[model samples]
Target: GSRRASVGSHRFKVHNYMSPTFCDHCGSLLWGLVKQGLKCEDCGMNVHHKCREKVANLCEFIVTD
Candidate 1:
């Protein structure tokens, strides 16, 4: 009954500051050729090793600054 709540699953209006390849979950701009090191400062939204697997299909957008 205590499943881990899904992270970032809400569509948000894309902001100007947001890059085309930014992480919808963390709002971090996706950088580097690998494109596998981006992360969110607030929710630990990362994409390394297996971070994506842990939160698959949960990367949604949240509008805010």
Candidate 2:
């Protein structure tokens, strides 16, 4: 199946948390030592790997630059 590669121009990549951060989508704790969740390389939005598709398509960072 084909799926969208980005969310409103956001290029989310695997991000490991060095500090505590909440999921922007679900408002849950990001737990892990490595590869905790996904973070948009463009917009800085954070979300869980399972919640990426549920994020709002409101990447303002692509427009502000």
Candidate 3:
């Protein structure tokens, strides 16, 4: 048997599993974590529920044992 390497774009969907006390993207305290989603105070970036899927897709690989 031989090893094979495969590369493909992978996009990770960031789901708000829990009400993060701090910004996930940037370690910053949320003034008042909004339900609709809040913006990163440090980076001034807005993150919404659906926006999680907008993560940059890059090369990724998987190995099976």
Best by TM-score: 2
lDDT of 3 by residue, 8-45 (tens): 55433333324555544444543443454444332334
For model 2, the local distance difference test gives 0.82
What overall lDDT goes with each candidate model? 0.44, 0.82, 0.43
Give per-residue CA lDDT, model 2, range 23-43, as digits (tens).
Answer: 999999988878999998877
Q: In model 2, what are the clashing residue pairs, if there are any?
A: none
lDDT tens digits by residue: candidate 1, 1-65: 44454455422221222334555445555554554454544344454333344455445444344
Count: clashes, candidate 3: 0
Clashes of 1: 1
CA shift at 33, candidate 3, in angstroms?
A: 11
In model 2, where do residues sit more than 4 Å from their true spots?
A: 1-8, 62-65
